[PDB]
Amino acid sequence: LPQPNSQVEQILAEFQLQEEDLKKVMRRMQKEMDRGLRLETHEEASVKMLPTYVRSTPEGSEVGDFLSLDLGGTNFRVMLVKVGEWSVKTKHQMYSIPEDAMTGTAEMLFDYISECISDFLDKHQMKHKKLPLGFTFNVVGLLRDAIKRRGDFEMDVVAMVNDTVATMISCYYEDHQCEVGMIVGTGCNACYMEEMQNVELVEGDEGRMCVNTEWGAFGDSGELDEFLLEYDRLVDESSANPGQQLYEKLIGGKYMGELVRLVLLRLVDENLLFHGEASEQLRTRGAFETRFVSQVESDTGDRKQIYNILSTLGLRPSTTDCDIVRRACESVSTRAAHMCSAGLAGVINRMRESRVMRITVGVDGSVYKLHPSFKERFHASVRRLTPSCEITFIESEEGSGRGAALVSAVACKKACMLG
Ligand SMILES: O=C(Nc1ncc(F)s1)[C@H](CC1CCOCC1)n1ncc2c(S(=O)(=O)C3CC3)cccc21
Ligand SMILES: OC[C@H]1O[C@H](O)[C@H](O)[C@@H](O)[C@@H]1O
């Protein structure tokens, strides 16, 4: 790599977060999680720490057979599942959606889906049962409505679990040390197994329960204020919910490309990029897509991806411009990974207080899966902040559908247990 421009690096260095800063943030996140878990402060807590009612032990044993419905792009999988003593038995059918039903109203699509479910129930002689059904990936309402509209067979569509909870469970299927689920995509959230005695919103002492942190809300009371840059404040001011979800705004894919756009305009204004002239597309809110960040960071060193991204924005960038854009993208990404690791570090250090603790964390989301070096920087930062823990990270892939089927089993059992 070459000798970097000194004035560009001075602007990009603002994004740096040292260990001490991350320790502060992590420590602040832990206080906020404490507030969320306690009865007396839960209603006022910004970080809600929602009990999911997903317990460490088996419940809802009166659930044998259920349907799992995997909703994909242009098709869907209908699956019959039997849980035994657990022994997950499955059989399934892939259906392709006609363009006829793809291009109609949402009602006509779910009419089609119900028809397919009916066919599947006929094939396996199950139409007398009345099974619970869970979704995997107001589709619920659409399906409830479409089933009622049919009125031949009877079915119970259950409430979905949160996506962090689905992530943790499907990963749990492949690794029983998985006790944390995390999403870094358009938003950012995490769930983990908490001791029952810490979950004050549910009476009970024994075992563990999954808690949905909903930690994106963090920042409400100023916990992030000293870490916010001019670009962050601009993104906040122009958002749908200014002053809310400040943690998520520092991390999620929703605002990542926009932060980069603002860093590039700052550099143009300093006459350090594009000769002090920005295009109209670059001055357009939303024009720099988050997907562009990961494309720019994928570049092998030839600058063809960066040049081709920047050319779609009416810019004619020299090789130096391209290198600057790479570095602007890297600073934003790296900061997101640092902020995210402080949240996860807080959770893992808290769990450790009740147990080398060996733990698996299940992770999903476009930012985490698709961004070139994000997961790596994120891993190294989390591990740095979690002494006396050995952390394994896995992405759910479940190449047979059984992790997905377990997600539906748990959701159906919980719906039953809750009435
Ligand atoms: O069913 C569960 N919880 C519920 N809460 C409320 C309901 F209505 S249901 C738990 C959930 C897991 C989630 C991840 O953290 C650990 C617990 N659950 N799910 C599979 C499983 C197995 S298993 O036999 O499936 C295992 C070999 C694969 C044994 C023991 C408890 C098991
Ligand atoms: O999709 C990841 C997360 O995004 C947002 O933070 C949602 O509030 C949360 O419910 C979800 O888990």
Curated annotation (Swiss-Prot):
GO MF assignments: ATP binding; D-glucose binding; fructokinase activity; glucokinase activity; glucose sensor activity; mannokinase activity
Functional pathway: Carbohydrate metabolism; hexose metabolism; Carbohydrate degradation; glycolysis; D-glyceraldehyde 3-phosphate and glycerone phosphate from D-glucose: step 1/4
PROSITE patterns cross-referenced by the UniProt entry: HEXOKINASE_1, HEXOKINASE_2
Consequence of substituting residue 60 to D: In MODY2; likely benign; mildly increases glucokinase activity
EC code(s) of this entry: 2.7.1.1
Variant or mutagenesis effect after changing residue 404 to T: In PNDM1; decreased stability; increased glucokinase activity; increased affinity for glucose
Main location: cytoplasm
Effect of residue 408 to A: Increased glucokinase activity based on measure of catalytic efficiency. Increased affinity for glucose
Effect of residue 369 to A: Small change in glucokinase activity
Effect on the protein upon substituting residue 351 to T: In PNDM1; decreased stability; increased glucokinase activity; no effect on affinity for glucose
Outcome reported for the amino acid change (mutating residue 57 to I): In HHF3; increased glucokinase activity based on measure of catalytic efficiency; increased affinity for glucose; loss of inhibition by GCKR; unchanged affinity for ATP
Activity regulation (record text): Subject to allosteric regulation. Low glucose and high fructose-6-phosphate triggers association with the inhibitor GCKR followed by sequestration in the nucleus.
pH dependence: Optimum pH is 6-8 with glucose as substrate. Optimum pH is 9-10 with glucosamine as substrate.
Annotated consequence of substituting residue 35 to H: In MODY2; decreased enzyme stability shown by thermostability assays; no effect on kinetic parameters for glucokinase activity in vitro
Entry keywords, A to Z: Allosteric enzyme, ATP-binding, Cytoplasm, Diabetes mellitus, Disease variant, Glycolysis, Kinase, Mitochondrion, Nucleotide-binding, Nucleus, Transferase
Effect seen on changing residue 184 to M: In MODY2; no effect on stability; decreased glucokinase activity; decreased affinity for glucose
Phenotype when changing residue 214 to A: Inactive enzyme with no glucokinase activity
Effect of residue 169 to F: Increased glucokinase activity based on measure of catalytic efficiency. Increased affinity for glucose
Residues given in the record as ATP binding sites: 70-75, 186, 253-254, 290-294, 366-370
Function: Catalyzes the phosphorylation of hexose, such as D-glucose, D-fructose and D-mannose, to hexose 6-phosphate (D-glucose 6-phosphate, D-fructose 6-phosphate and D-mannose 6-phosphate, respectively). Compared to other hexokinases, has a weak affinity for D-glucose, and is effective only when glucose is abundant. Mainly expressed in pancreatic beta cells and the liver and constitutes a rate-limiting step in glucose metabolism in these tissues.
Similarity annotation: Belongs to the hexokinase family.
Name of the protein: Hexokinase-4
Lineage: Eukaryota, Metazoa, Chordata, Craniata, Vertebrata
